[PDB]
Structure 1
Amino acid sequence: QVSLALVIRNLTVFTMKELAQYMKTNVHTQANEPNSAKKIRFLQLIIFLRTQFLKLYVLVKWTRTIHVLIDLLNWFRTTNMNVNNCIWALKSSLNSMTNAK
């Protein structure tokens, strides 16, 4: 099982680590690089983090709509491959027992 709180925790830790790494890289980057490139890179990183947080927002909205269809869906899938496994087991049993025929 995975909790939405654990997704929030890991995503926020990853965002903090990425921001810290970007800040450190900007710190030890030589000043000869133009500030425009650094600003563009920071904007791109902010856009990526915003996209990740918007994916999380979609997971929040999904969980707000949500489990009923997912429970029925999983139960029907379990029945389906249980039937398939029963068929395969029957075929294997006949293949094995044909020798004893």
Structure 2
Amino acid sequence: WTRTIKQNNFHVLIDLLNWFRTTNMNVNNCIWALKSSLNSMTNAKLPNVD
């Protein structure tokens, strides 16, 4: 199996797919950042006067 790889770039393969996991997680991280910004707004209003 080690003879199958010619350029010995299997670490490049592994780093590429870990980078792919990071990039596939960045969009959901942005969504959760917007959700945290949403949850920050719950206390920050001023209700109707009584």
Where does the alignment leave 5 or more consecutive residues of structure 1 unmatched? 1-61
TM-score by length of 1: 0.31
Where does the alignment leave 5 or more consecutive residues of structure 2 unmatched? 6-10, 46-50
Percent sequence identity over matched residues?
100
- SS of the residue 1:100 aligns to: coil
Measure the CA separation in 2 of the matches of 1:84 and 1:75.
15
Report the Cα offset of residue 63 of structure 1: 6.6
Distance 1:63 1:94, change over 3 A: farther
- Structure 1 runs (4+) greater than 3 angstroms displaced: 62-66
Distance 1:70 1:99, change over 3 A: same
Let me know the Cα RMSD of the aligned residues.
Answer: 2.4
Report the Cα offset of residue 78 of structure 1: 0.9
Q: Which structure shows the bigger proportion of residues in helix conformation?
A: 1
- SS of the residue 1:97 aligns to: coil
TM-score by length of 2: 0.51
Distance 1:63 1:70, change over 3 A: farther
Report the Cα offset of residue 83 of structure 1: 2.3
Report the Cα offset of residue 75 of structure 1: 0.7
